[PDB]
Write a protein that binds this ligand. Structure first.
Ligand SMILES: COCCN(C)C(=O)c1cnn(C)c1C(=O)Nc1ccn2cc(-c3ccccc3)nc2c1
Ligand SMILES: [Mg+2]
Ligand SMILES: [Zn+2]
Length: 313
């Protein structure tokens, strides 16, 4: 109850900034998350013992893959923490509880492969979940862990508040399917530009939380350049393994997944910044002005990939 988590001074300060890197000390990441729940939500929103037990079972259900691993879960939660802390009054009590949990759980049991590859492989998950295949699985794994004995961190909510929190989590995790981001962001662009955007409308709040999810999920593009560049190596380690597995099913992979087209990464990064990331952070900044540092850092990283192409690195 009177047991605050405290970080060393440098982390205490930098954890409040959008561009914080959680560091290479895995054993500090649970403490970093609890710190963030305690400041974002309150020391009372979860029983510490149940929260620690939930965090450790979540960690165990992330796999040893290059990118979609436990470090990604905690990194995405931190980006959400920074959004929430910069927008203190915009979010409900249930939202603050659900959203850091959603981010921690949003890639549970990821195997390092896309929805596309599961469907070409004919994986059993592609028969159970015909769209947003991995994202429905990540949600199913979150509910499984919530039901383990002594892992119900929501045990003190009413029936209807529990239903509401699990719905915020389900929609927040589904929204991390980038296939859904394009049309979510177009509707938010139109809604904002015609002045129809209404944060009392639940279906509008859902769209805004969806965009916050894409923003936190893609947040490697918002870090200092060496973090961005080193994270991209892990991203391609996965893409290129998927490509290899496409070649084993007799399917030429897309160039993004073909390690033989390593050469064209820089231009592929530009496309991604221009088509996905910059538009994501631009619309987020229109809706939630205090998130502007995410857009500014993304633009800085776009300029770094432009320097790589000009062989200035
Ligand atoms: C939520 O997603 C989770 C991870 N995923 C899926 C990401 O997309 C993602 C997340 N963060 N970042 C930075 C990325 C990322 O790098 N994306 C892309 C997207 C298209 N490309 C096309 C080419 C390319 C390469 C070589 C040749 C031609 C094209 N390279 C890319 C890279
Ligand atoms: Mg995912
Ligand atoms: Zn993710």
């Amino acid at each position: 109850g009177l047991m605050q988590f405290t970080l060393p001074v440098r982390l205490c300060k930098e954890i409040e900034l959008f561009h914080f890197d959680i560091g290479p000390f895995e054993n500090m990441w649970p403490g970093i998350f609890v710190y963030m729940v305690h400041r974002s939500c309150g020391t009372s929103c979860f029983e510490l013992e149940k929260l620690c037990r939930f965090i450790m079972s979540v960690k165990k259900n992330y796999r040893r893959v290059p990118y979609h691993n436990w470090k990604h879960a905690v990194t995405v939660a931190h980006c959400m923490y920074a959004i929430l802390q910069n927008n203190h009054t915009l979010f409900t009590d249930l939202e603050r509880k659900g959203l850091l949990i959603a981010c921690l759980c949003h890639d549970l049991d990821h195997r390092g492969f896309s929805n596309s590859y599961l469907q070409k492989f004919d994986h059993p998950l592609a028969a159970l979940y015909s769209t947003s295949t991995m994202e429905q699985h990540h949600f199913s794994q979150t509910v499984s862990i919530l039901q383990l004995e002594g892992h119900n961190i929501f045990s003190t909510l009413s029936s209807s508040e529990y239903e509401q929190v699990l719905e915020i989590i389900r929609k927040a995790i589904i929204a991390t399917d980038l296939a859904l981001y394009f049309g979510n962001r177009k509707q938010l662009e139109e809604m904002y530009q015609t002045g129809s955007l209404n944060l009392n409308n639940q279906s509008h709040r859902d769209r805004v939380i969806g965009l916050m999810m894409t923003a936190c999920d893609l947040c490697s593009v918002t870090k200092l350049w060496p973090v961005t560049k080193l994270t991209a190596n892990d991203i391609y380690a996965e893409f290129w393994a998927e490509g290899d597995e496409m070649k084993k099913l007799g399917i030429q992979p897309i160039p993004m997944m073909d390690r033989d087209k390593k050469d064209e990464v820089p231009q592929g990064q530009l496309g991604f910044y221009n088509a996905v990331a910059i538009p994501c952070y631009t619309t987020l900044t229109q809706i939630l002005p205090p998130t502007e540092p995410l857009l500014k850092a993304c633009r800085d990283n776009l300029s770094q990939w432009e320097k790589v192409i000009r062989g200035e690195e």
